[PDB]
């Protein structure tokens, strides 16, 4: 037949740059996760995000999660560089229990959690302008505290706000203060939000309270590589197409293995 | 803490319509992360989810009930309420007005809305006979 | 569309012993399972949070564990107080119950 229908199982390791997230999500080694701290600097072709990655830091969740998720694979790095934020009048470095970085407490390593100093929470209102020439990714976050007394704890004022805005646009996220389940004892949240600040734009952070304020920004780049879904292990072996089913031999006119495929291989016939 | 206490007509004739209404205490039905919900438990089904209503407005209903199912809030006073429209036989079963939410955490690969029921009334039984 | 079979319906078991629950989805639900207890009259109790997340008061005895389409809770050590219904329940679809009984 012209159908090729059958996969080895395997998705070969050459000649696309497969990056293997054994445990890690797309995001989760984004953000910092730690135990995922190996991710850093990375390239790929093809990320293979295994359908048993967790995430074991503070819980969270992403609004507008696909559209970052292509973006970053899209992108085929994870190069973050570190900025100097003048964060004046807050505490810094902030952690929790539910994400266990050493023995004690921690966090994502790519977000600053921002806590009140002494008695105070000013209106932060720093900036960063993108004098460089590609693309800056920031990633930072408001959190949500489980109750009114944990708002004020944290953040001196009642009811914390995020602004961060460029020339282009601007995102105005107010907490939401209530008890969830438990997540890994936490009745609270985060929310992971992103923005892209092309060259010779401004970012502009303002905010009095509940700011999961970001570290740096991610090398951006015009890439083509993918991320794929795909329990098949990783081999030493070459196939010029890579679907979730693993590697199939590409040269038949036409494959139904799967719809998704990445690499030069047939046209999908159901 | 917050309780939910459901209350209305232990019984209704067969093609009339239902109505009960839980009342939260030490809470607001106006929160905006909480959905105030409506599951019924009869022993030879188990618990079936009938619908959520929001605060905003927005409501949820399972497709099982053919739009029988109708569910308000009335914020002045703290209640919402079930309406069961055109009851039969089988609509006999306990029901128990439930605070819950919808949440989308990124906890494994392969993202799902999770719901949950985190605070139960005392139920109540509700006989649907001639 | 989602459906979603609870198993054993019925196992007896005697106090200190191991018992292990499981949820079976039809599809792929990622961690999106909560399991709820119900002891006789009462309304059931909210256990786990996403199949592992133990809830506030629940006895760390209790466990929940798996992904994807199977999920079990575990109790190490059943004792006295835990003869309880219990349900797994995955958005508007509750499982059948398993109807724990002390042997």
């Known amino acids: 037949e012209l159908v090729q229908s059958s996969s080895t199982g395997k998705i070969c390791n050459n000649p696309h740059r497969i990056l293997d997230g054994i445990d890690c999500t797309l995001i989760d080694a984004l953000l910092g996760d730690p135990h995922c701290d190996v991710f850093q600097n990375e390239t790929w072709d093809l990320f293979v995000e295994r359908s048993k990655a967790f995430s074991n830091c503070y819980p969270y969740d992403v609004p507008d999660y696909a559209s970052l998720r292509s973006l970053v694979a899209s992108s085929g790095t994870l190069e973050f560089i570190t900025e100097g934020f003048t964060w004046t009048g807050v505490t810094q470095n902030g952690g929790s229990n539910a994400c266990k970085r050493g023995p004690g407490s921690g966090f994502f390593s790519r977000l600053n959690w921002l806590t009140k100093s002494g008695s105070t929470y000013p209106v932060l209102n720093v900036t960063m302008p993108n004098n460089d020439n590609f693309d800056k990714l920031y990633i930072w976050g408001i959190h949500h505290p489980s109750t009114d007394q944990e708002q004020t704890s944290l953040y001196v004022q009642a009811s914390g706000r995020v602004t961060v805005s460029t020339r282009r646009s601007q995102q105005t996220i107010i907490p939401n203060i209530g008890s969830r389940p438990w997540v890994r004892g936490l009745s609270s949240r985060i929310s992971i939000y992103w923005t892209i600040v092309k060259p010779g734009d401004v970012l502009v952070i303002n905010s009095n309270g509940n700011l999961i304020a970001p570290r740096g920004y991610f090398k951006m780049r015009t890439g083509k590589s993918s991320i794929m879904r795909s329990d098949a292990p990783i081999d030493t072996c070459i196939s010029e197409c890579i679907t979730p089913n693993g590697s199939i031999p590409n040269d038949k006119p036409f494959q139904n293995v799967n719809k998704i495929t990445y690499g030069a291989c047939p046209k999908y016939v159901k | 803490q917050v309780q939910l206490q459901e209350s209305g007509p232990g019984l209704v004739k067969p093609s009339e319509t239902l109505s009960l209404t839980c009342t939260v205490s030490?809470?607001?039905?106006?929160?905006?992360?909480?959905?105030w919900s409506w599951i019924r438990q009869t022993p030879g089904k188990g618990l079936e989810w009938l619908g959520y209503?929001?605060?905003?407005?927005?409501?949820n209903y399972n497709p099982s009930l053919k739009s029988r199912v109708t569910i308000s809030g009335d914020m002045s006073k703290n209640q919402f309420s079930l309406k069961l429209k055109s009851v039969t036989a089988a609509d006999t079963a306990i029901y128990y007005c439930?605070?819950?939410?919808?949440?989308?955490?990124?906890?494994?690969?392969?993202?799902?809305?999770?719901?949950?029921?985190?605070?139960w009334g005392r139920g109540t039984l509700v006989t649907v006979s001639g | 569309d989602i459906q979603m079979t609870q198993t054993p319906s019925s196992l007896s078991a005697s106090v200190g012993d191991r018992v292990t629950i499981t949820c079976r989805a039809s599809?792929?639900?990622?961690?999106?399972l909560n399991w709820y207890q119900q002891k006789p009259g009462e309304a059931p109790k909210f256990l786990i949070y996403?199949?592992?997340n133990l809830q506030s008061g629940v006895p760390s005895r209790f466990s929940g564990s798996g992904s994807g389409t199977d999920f079990t809770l575990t109790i190490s050590s059943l004792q006295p107080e835990d003869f309880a219904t219990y349900y797994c329940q995955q958005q508007g679809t509750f499982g059948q119950g398993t109807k724990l009984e002390i042997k």
């Open positions: 439930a605070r819950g939410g919808v949440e989308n955490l990124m906890l494994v690969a392969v993202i799902q809305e999770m719901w949950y029921f985190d605070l």
């Open positions: 996403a199949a592992s």
């Open positions: 599809q792929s639900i990622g961690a999106s």
């Open positions: 209503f929001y605060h905003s407005g927005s409501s």
């Open positions: 030490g809470g607001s039905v106006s929160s905006n992360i909480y959905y």
